Design a protein around this ligand. Sequence first.
Ligand SMILES: *CCC(=O)N1C[C@@H]2CCC[C@@H](Nc3ccc(C(F)(F)F)cc3)[C@@H]2C1
Length: 210
Amino acid sequence: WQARGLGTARLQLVEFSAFVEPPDAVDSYQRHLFVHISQHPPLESVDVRQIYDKFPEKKGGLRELYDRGPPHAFFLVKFWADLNWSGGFYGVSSQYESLEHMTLTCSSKVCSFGKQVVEKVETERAQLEDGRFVYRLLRSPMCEYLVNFLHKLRQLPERYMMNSVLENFTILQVVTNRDTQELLLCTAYVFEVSTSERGAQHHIYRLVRD
Ligand SMILES: *CCC(=O)N1C[C@@H]2CCC[C@@H](Nc3ccc(C(F)(F)F)cc3)[C@@H]2C1
């Protein structure tokens, strides 16, 4: 009964991307993906206690949320970001899918050294498509801390210096039913840089606890 991708039975992540389009994409289109999960054998498990220290610890960080439950909704995603590509569009697209009509509240907490730095909260409503309800947070503008972070991260004269910086940089991402405050999906993101000739890639774990 364990999860096999990023989703419960109540809410599945269809696709998520963070991308940049260069200014000349209006002439011939071109999209560079920093990170990408597409979802059109169990997932491995990571103890949630090992990554507690990387996330905030008062209200709406990991200890309270996991003790809130439900335990099966909690995932860790490890990203190898692609960091080779000035004034283009920096974007996040998310799609979710579900069997209910809900209203989704998506929080994205960005944490540096395990304390929250910026947070964006978005509301999306179900639109019914083909017997299933679809939630489309498409082409959301990436918030300006992270765009500035990416340019300065790219500058770094070593690739292992980027991984040192990204070690203390995490994103926590909580999706709730707006009406009823049920947690549907909590995903913790930890970050490495990819090499240039490799693309972006990801590994998805379930978060489990004793
Ligand atoms: C304030 C930022 C914001 O609104 N969001 C939402 C989106 C949610 C989670 C993914 C994240 N996008 C990024 C992924 C990866 C990188 C990096 F630096 F390449 F590893 C940057 C942004 C944003 C945060």
